[PDB]
Structure formats: structure tokens, C-alpha cells
Amino acid sequence: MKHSKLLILGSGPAGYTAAVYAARANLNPVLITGRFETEIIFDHINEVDFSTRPFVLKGDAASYSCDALIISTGASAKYLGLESEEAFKGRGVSACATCDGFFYRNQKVAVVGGGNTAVEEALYLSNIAAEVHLIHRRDSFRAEKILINRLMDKVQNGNIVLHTDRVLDEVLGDEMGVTGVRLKDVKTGGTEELDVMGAFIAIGHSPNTQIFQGQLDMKDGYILVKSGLEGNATQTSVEGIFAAGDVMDHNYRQAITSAGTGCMAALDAERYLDSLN
Amino acid sequence: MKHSKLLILGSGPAGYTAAVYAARANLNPVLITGMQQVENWPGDPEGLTGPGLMDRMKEHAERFETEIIFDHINEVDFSTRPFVLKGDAASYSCDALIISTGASAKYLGLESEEAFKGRGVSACATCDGFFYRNQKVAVVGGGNTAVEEALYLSNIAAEVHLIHRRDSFRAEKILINRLMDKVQNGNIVLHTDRVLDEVLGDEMGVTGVRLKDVKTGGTEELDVMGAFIAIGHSPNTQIFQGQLDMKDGYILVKSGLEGNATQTSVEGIFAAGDVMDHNYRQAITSAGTGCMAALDAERYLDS
Numbered sequence: 001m002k003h004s005k006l007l008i009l010g011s012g013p014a015g016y017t018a019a020v021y022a023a024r025a026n027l028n029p030v031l032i033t034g035r036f037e038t039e040i041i042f043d044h045i046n047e048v049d050f051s052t053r054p055f056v057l058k059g060d061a062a063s064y065s066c067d068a069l070i071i072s073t074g075a076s077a078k079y080l081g082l083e084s085e086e087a088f089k090g091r092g093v094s095a096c097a098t099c100d101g102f103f104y105r106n107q108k109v110a111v112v113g114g115g116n117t118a119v120e121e122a123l124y125l126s127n128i129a130a131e132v133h134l135i136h137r138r139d140s141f142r143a144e145k146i147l148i149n150r151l152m153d154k155v156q157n158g159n160i161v162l163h164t165d166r167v168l169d170e171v172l173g174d175e176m177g178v179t180g181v182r183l184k185d186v187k188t189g190g191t192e193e194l195d196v197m198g199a200f201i202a203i204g205h206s207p208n209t210q211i212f213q214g215q216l217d218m219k220d221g222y223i224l225v226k227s228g229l230e231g232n233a234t235q236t237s238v239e240g241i242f243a244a245g246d247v248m249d250h251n252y253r254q255a256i257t258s259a260g261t262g263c264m265a266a267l268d269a270e271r272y273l274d275s276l277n
Numbered sequence: 278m279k280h281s282k283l284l285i286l287g288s289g290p291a292g293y294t295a296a297v298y299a300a301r302a303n304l305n306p307v308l309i310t311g312m313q314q315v316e317n318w319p320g321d322p323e324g325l326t327g328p329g330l331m332d333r334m335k336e337h338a339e340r341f342e343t344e345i346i347f348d349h350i351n352e353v354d355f356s357t358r359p360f361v362l363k364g365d366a367a368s369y370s371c372d373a374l375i376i377s378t379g380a381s382a383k384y385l386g387l388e389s390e391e392a393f394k395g396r397g398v399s400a401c402a403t404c405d406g407f408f409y410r411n412q413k414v415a416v417v418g419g420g421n422t423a424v425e426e427a428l429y430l431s432n433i434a435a436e437v438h439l440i441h442r443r444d445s446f447r448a449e450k451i452l453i454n455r456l457m458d459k460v461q462n463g464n465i466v467l468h469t470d471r472v473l474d475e476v477l478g479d480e481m482g483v484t485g486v487r488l489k490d491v492k493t494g495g496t497e498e499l500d501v502m503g504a505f506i507a508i509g510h511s512p513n514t515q516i517f518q519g520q521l522d523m524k525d526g527y528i529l530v531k532s533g534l535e536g537n538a539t540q541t542s543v544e545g546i547f548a549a550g551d552v553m554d555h556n557y558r559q560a561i562t563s564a565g566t567g568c569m570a571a572l573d574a575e576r577y578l579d580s
Binding site: 145 | 280407410428433455490500527529532535538554555557562568572576
């Protein structure tokens with residue numbers, strides 16, 4: 001079994017920043033992902049045991065042991081689970097509007113979701129695409145007051161089209177990609193077709209914390225963390241385990257903020273490891 | 278009296294990151310630097326130490342038409358809304374305030390010390406300690422900050438030479454215990470009854486320090502690759518003293534995991550950067566809270 005003083009779990013700004021600071025603290029960090037002395041290992045981890053004081057993480061390639069652990073596995077994009085949604089993923093279906101927005105210059109696209117994040121994808125694509133169709137299951141968007149007024153003006157005077165009380169039933173298209181989506185009325189059950197070139201599913205974010213369910217104090221899927229103003233801010237409920245980035249932040253979700261907590265986690269870890277004597 | 282919907286008070290990575298995110302939210306922020314007004318390159322490739330992160334943000338903020346004002350704030354009034362910031366040239370008013378006045382590190386005041394700042398003289402071991410893997414370094418200080426720095430550098434440097442003006446160090450219990458062990462069994466060497474007489478070096482960086490014996494007046498030289506001045510910090514919060522909840526000079530903020538974490542005691546007044554952080558003091562952590570402060574201010578102004 002591979003043993004190291006520090007193990008980093010993640011690959012985003014939080015885990016990468018933690019790796020640099022850990023390496024600059026001369027901790028020889030190992031980073032598992034799914035420049036300084038950083039061993040970056042490609043592996044997926046299935047089971048972890050935090051009850052024993054050389055934390056054992058079990059992955060497909062090997063088993064890993066560590067005296068300190070930093071968790072920064074990020075938050076993945078929620079999906080619906082349809083077969084056509086799965087089929088046209090990357091061929092007309094996406095969750096990052098910024099990554100794929102430019103391909104739909106002066107074309108018709110659709111955005112699915114009712115959260116504050118879904119309106120952001122619509123308002124962003126509003127200036128890029130000819131039309132943006134916002135699909136939600138309810139007749140009321142659960143966003144902030146400005147966002148609704150931004151949407152209202154864009155729905156009225158602009159090119160944003162509303163589709164309240166609509167569940168995405170199926171994604172249509174040919175061998176090339178998406179050519180339309182089938183909406184279903186949540187009230188009547190009847191269908192209604194929309195001819196669009198792309199579909200963006202922005203329904204919400206899911207923290208990748210399932211592997212630590214019963215071993216770390218969580219709250220709605222997010223790792224609970226000490227926080228505060230007296231240091232050791234990124235410590236979890238288990239001594240020697242620290243969380244950073246999207247796995248513990250459901251209010252800011254910025255790269256610069258995730259990089260900030262990653263730095264905190266590495267310094268917290270350095271101070272924990274330096275206390276084992 | 279010049280008014281703004283949002284006022285940024287500070288010229289570091291915290292304030293300029295708040296200015297970028299505020300101008301990104303079409304809040305048209307105004308930034309008060311704090312002072313009234315040949316170069317280095319390339320710098321840290323990771324953008325974590327040095328002025329790199331602060332220089333990008335300032336250029337991003339100016340590229341977004343952020344009004345930057347060179348002025349020093351004499352006093353403030355946070356009782357009445359909008360807030361009154363009495364400056365040195367003019368006064369300023371705002372509906373929301375972001376305070377990133379910083380917490381400057383204390384320096385000894387030597388001419389040679391100032392000459393080698395950023396060229397081997399540092400006040401943050403976690404910022405610059407990695408340049409000295411398996412080398413000799415000096416740490417000046419006799420309090421809890423110096424002991425913290427000496428212990429951190431002990432894992433990095435070949436030798437840590439801890440310089441103190443008298444014969445005893447005052448620090449937390451467990452830190453003295455670690456230092457005791459490192460002094461008797463490790464790579465930490467004590468230099469008591471010593472004052473820093475001069476930092477020695479060349480155009481490349483620090484190569485030694487000259488120490489003076491406070492009991493005899495005699496001098497000695499230590500060959501070191503870097504000198505760390507660790508004698509404490511000064512939160513720049515004297516003008517808000519009897520008006521915001523503070524603690525050892527640092528702005529108390531809400532913190533927490535439910536958002537609005539940069540909120541001070543007075544609603545609409547937010548704090549970010551070293552002014553509310555005595556634990557990490559990194560450019561990236563100051564930038565993070567600067568971003569949080571700009572968002573907490575945006576959500577406040579929209580209500």
C-alpha cells in the first residue's frame with residue numbers, strides 16, 4: 001500500500017493550489033485526480049476508511065494511506081438520466097454554457113433548470129444565440145430578485161423565451177447532433193416540440209461526497225468545515241482531514257475562492273502534521 | 278461630497294479582487310488606495326507569492342473602468358447612512374463599504390533591511406520559505422510569530438537561525454515545546470541577546486546578517502541565504518476603532534458556511550484580506566475573501 005504524509009483528493013483550483021503550497025511546505029504531496037515535487041496519480045477512489053489513524057483510501061489502481069487528507073473533489077453537474085440525454089452528451093448536450101456557447105452564434109438553443117444558476121446560463125447565452133429557451137418544471141424561478149428582472153426584461157424586450165411547467169421528455173437529433181427537444185406539459189401530459197441546435201442542462205450541482213457519507217459530518221451533501229477566524233478553518237469533523245473548494249462552499253463557487261480554501265487546507269494540514277510529535 | 282454605491286478601501290490583492298468582481302457585476306465601484314500618488318520580472322510562475330496576483334487584478338480593474346482614488350482616510354462615520362469616509366483630500370460617501378486596509382508586517386527599520394525587501398528579506402515564511410530548501414535562513418523575533426515561522430521553516434531549510442533581542446521567547450505552550458525539541462535535536466539554532474545590525478548581500482540577494490551583542494556591543498556575522506523578519510503585524514484599523522467590533526485590531530466578520538461571510542458588525546460594511554485574517558495572510562486567501570466581499574456587497578445592495 002502506498003503511504004504518504006499528505007494526500008490530495010481533487011483536480012480543480014482547490015486541489016491544485018493545495019498541492020503547490022504543500023509542496024512548498026516540503027510535504028511531498030500526492031494528488032489523486034479523476035512544477036514542484038507533486039506526484040499526480042490518475043485514479044478513481046471507491047471506498048475510504050477514516051476510523052483508523054492511517055487513513056486508507058481504496059482506488060481502482062492501488063490502495064493509499066495517509067496521515068493527513070485534503071478533500072477537494074469539486075461539485076459535478078446534475079443531469080436528468082434520460083437515454084437521449086445520455087446519447088447526445090457532448091454532441092449537442094452540455095452543462096458548461098461558456099465552454100460551448102460560441103458554437104451557437106445566431107442559432108437556437110435551450111436551457112433547462114429553475115435555479116439561480118440556470119438563469120445565468122440563459123442570460124449569458126442570450127447575447128450569444130439567436131434565441132434561448134428556458135425550460136423549468138414550475139411556474140416560478142427560484143433565483144434572486146435582480147435575476148428575475150434581468151430575465152423579465154430579456155424575456156419581454158429581448159430574445160429569451162419562457163417554457164414554464166415543462167419537463168424535458170426526449171432529446172431529438174440525427175447522427176450529427178441535436179436538432180430538437182421534446183417538452184412535456186407537467187399538467188396535461190401533452191408534448192410540444194422545439195427545434196433547437198443545442199441543449200444545456202443547468203439544473204443544479206451535486207457535491208462529490210458520496211464516498212464519505214457516514215464518516216464525515218455533512219449537511220445536504222456538503223462537507224461541514226470548522227471555518228472561523230482563529231485558523232484551522234478547513235478542518236472536517238475528523239482530525240487530520242480537511243475539505244476545500246466546491247465540496248464545502250455552496251455560496252460563492254468561484255475559482256479564486258476555491259483556490260483560497262485550497263491554500264488554507266494545505267497550511268492547516270502542515271500545522272496538523274507538524275503537531276504529531 | 279463624492280458618492281458611490283460601493284466603496285473599496287484598500288490597495289492590496291483583496292481590494293483589487295473585490296473591485297474586479299464588483300465592476301464585473303456592473304456596480305461601478307470606487308477604490309481608495311490608501312496613499313497619495315525600477316521593476317521586476319517574470320516573478321512567481323504560480324502567482325502565489327510576490328506582487329503578481331495584485332498586479333493582474335489592478336490591471337483587470339483598470340481595464341474594467343474602475344475609478345481609483347489616491348487618498349488617505351482621516352476618519353469615518355458608520356452611524357448614519359450613507360457612510361461618510363472623511364479623507365485627506367476630499368470626503369466620500371457610500372451605501373456599501375468593503376474594508377481591505379490590510380495588516381502590514383512590522384519591520385525593524387534598518388536601511389539594509391529595506392534594501393533587501395523582496396530580494397531575500399521577507400516577513401512571511403509561508404510566502405517565501407520554499408526558495409530556501411536545504412539552505413541556511415535567519416528568523417528575527419522573540420514572540421509567537423517568530424516561533425511559528427521558525428517551526429515552519431525548520432521542515433524546509435537546512436538550518437534555521439532564530440535571532441532574539443533578549444534571552445527568552447514568549448509563545449504558546451506547545452510551540453515552545455516543539456522549539457525546545459528542534460533546538461536540542463534538530464536544525465534550529467538560537468541566537469539570544471542579539472540585535473540585527475545589518476543585512477548583508479549582493480544584487481542577487483541576501484548572503485548574511487551582522488548581529489550585535491546587546492550586552493557587550495560586539496558584532497558577529499552569520500551566513501544565511503535569507504532573512505525573515507517576524508515581529509508581528511499591525512492591522513490598519515485605527516480609524517474604525519470605536520465603530521466596528523474588532524479583536525486585537527482585526528475586523529471581526531461573520532465567517533461561516535451560509536454566505537455573507539465578510540459581513541462586519543454594521544450592515545453594508547464588509548471586510549476582506551489581511552484586515553480580518555491573522556492565520557494565513559496569503560495573496561490567494563486575500564483574493565478569495567475580496568471576491569466574497571464583492572459578492573456579499575452585491576447581494577446586499579440588491580435588497
